[PDB]
């Protein structure tokens, strides 16, 4: 079914955001794992999986609308070197992606692509959940101190 | 994640509507229970629980958006003294709450808080279900008469 | 069964105490949940439910005694802004409520309303349990320090 | 263990109340059963059994306290000839029994027989439950009319 | 179905016998229980229940035959103060009751109330079973001596 | 929660009574066991355990009220040398303890410590059950003679 | 079987040690419980139970040997006011008891009471296990600091 060209453009932009996040979350997860911070590996691994699911949804939607999914161009990663930097980088990436989602959701409505919009609202709900987790962890580091926070990560849940 | 100030205000207003409904539905249920009208107790109790779940959702959303949930102010209850009066009061409260929801849902869209909107639309769907039940019960009283209607309530369904 | 007017007045005052506590405990719970302090959310949520059960018993007893339950007036909440403040506010509310329960229990005995008295003694036993938990948590914050205390809350027991 | 003479006298008076109620509830039940009012038979039969249990408790307590249970004297029954008359007679008997219970409960406290008091408070709680049911049934007859009320009794609940 | 007036009169006399026996057996059971003679409590309690079942049958039959069951008048109890006295009193009561049953069975036959007769023959068979047990226990007391007999009662079979 | 000083003093006096009973019942139990009187060992062992549960309740209540449980002072035991002496000594101890409980229950009510009172009434009910068993055994020894009584103890129940 | 008088004297001395430990461990356990230190309550409670089992063994052995178990005299308790004091007091008590056990074990051998000796060696093995636990906890307090140690006690295992 031939979709709106700019809708497809937004879907490719959002897919691009998810592709950066998949890689950034996955590497962060395995850095945490290497450091013995098992609980952080578990959560970040699951966030990477969540973003893969989102990417799959964008890819399938673009193909249905007869566009070409772009998996070639990869945006800038910001890995970081310690726990706080890594979490802040993930939060910043999530915030940027949420801005793009809001723009795309408004546009899809204006051209009556309500199914693409509905998909994007569900994804935005998921991303706000990631944002809530990241903000919460960052605040916990400040409240209990980094040493107590690290100790809390060494055994799974 | 810092939310829009007026969105937070709307959520607190809607929370306020739920807090009134929680108490009014609960007291109505136990009044029905005292009178031996078990089926009406069962339904109204469940509606009270439903509004508690709505209140929980508003409280959690407000806190996420970094606002302060208002559980201090409580609007006017209208309890009534007989079955028809009690059900009509509940209906009037639901209709006023629906008006407030429609206004909030439109505004949330305008400022692109699509997740708050999605939550409110789900709540509005629940409230229209309560409105349907209440309108139906009131019409049944008129159709079969109050005496037959009350007899129908003395065993749970 | 027509009850003693002043017993009903006491029952309404105690119901009033429970209604403040329901709201305060629930908001505290969700504030803790937002901060990622899962254990504190779990306990405070269950205390809110306990106060709801107490309120239900008061409402049913008042109706049996042919009085009018008052769910319209809500007393002053004291939310607080940090963990120690919130816990101290809950403890102060519990202590005020226990004072009211003692007065009502003494009065019910003097007018031979032994069933109302029996109900209130069970509720007072529940409240003294909440007092014990709150005092214990506050002492633990002193003994192990706030940072260690917070770390201990981030996984559900 | 030798008990207080006046407490033993109270227990025998209360036992006497239970003995009247056992017979009156049982005959009412079987009258309802004859008339095809199965649901009223079920409830009144259960109330009769409840009073048998109370009588058993009085008999055992009296013997423990080294007194002589009096099962020889039987107070006046008031059977009645129609449903409303029968239920009102049961209610009147319950209310008279409750007055005697309150007097006995106060006196047992005065002579420090706290175990006899504890037993009586539990029994009074049961009696107030019967009073609640009776009052409710009588109000239902008034609200839905006798014909509708009788129709509602012909299937066991 | 309008029964024979004299049959109804006999059924009320027999009911009257059952009512005395219900109370006498039950008090005897609990006296035995107080004394630690568990086996005697168990048997006498079950005999009390058997007489309750008999009373229920009389009440239902009288009501079917359109008569008025008399539960108001209570004949003379003879409690006794020691085991042998109590058992002999129960036996004397059973023998008096069997006399009345024989008269009533003969009369019911003469007026063709064969269903009332059938009911009473079953009840008489039950009563002869109680007579057998009582006679046997009294004989055992004489044969093994009271002290051995009491020892044999201090556990439930 | 700071309790009343004299309530705490009563709780420690009652704890003292329980500590004596725990030891006396336990030694009596093992003396019975040594003699081959298994049934008496079983009951007295269980009574010792019951008193341990009571002691635990007093200890926990005292600590909650911010007092200091006294486990250092131990009252006078009266062991006895034969079955009758031992049981009579246990009975005298129980009677002394019930007297202290009655005084403490009255006082707790007067200072409005209704939860301490409720706990003590439950314990008093337990103690009256022990009194009943002890009185019953002593009477059985008289009624069947000591030789028959001992024979009845050599097999468990 | 008539035992050696001085063996019985040692068994009573050791029983005396166990009686002090039962009370000291139990009170310590409930102090820990009051403080919210659940893991310490659990272990100290179990140590109290272990000492009760030892006391039972001494009591039964003394009775077999035809001596008189002494449960009347209670040695000095040393409760303490904080975690470290309490644990050190328990350790000191265990060390004193172990000295007495070694003396008694040597003596029992010299008079050929090998079964009493065998019992005591098993008990000494148990006590050395308690000593190992107490020493370990005390060292942990020093190594991780008291605040970390307390935090580790708040959830069971």
Author numbering:
A (entry chain E), B (entry chain A), C (entry chain B), D (entry chain D), E (entry chain C), F (entry chain F), ...: 1 to 157
Q: Could you share sentences copied from the article?
A:
Ferritins are iron storage proteins that overcome the problems of toxicity and poor bioavailability of iron by catalyzing iron oxidation and mineralization through the activity of a diiron ferroxidase site. The capacity of cells to store iron in a bioavailable and safe form is a central feature of the strategy nature has evolved to overcome the dual problem of poor bioavailability of iron and the potential of the free metal to catalyze the formation of reactive radical species. This function is fulfilled by the ubiquitous ferritin family, members of which are composed of 24 subunits arranged to form a protein shell surrounding a hollow center. Bacterioferritins (BFRs) constitute a distinct sub-family of ferritins, found only in bacteria, which contain a markedly different diiron ferroxidase site.
BFR also contains five other Tyr and one other Trp, which are located further from the ferroxidase site. We sought to determine whether these aromatic residues are involved in coupling electron transfer to oxidation of Fe2+. Site-directed variants, in which each residue was substituted with Phe, were generated and the mineralization activity of the variant proteins was determined. These, along with previously reported structures of W35F and W133F BFRs and Y25F and Y58F BFR subunit dimers, showed that the substitutions did not cause any significant changes beyond the substituted side chain.
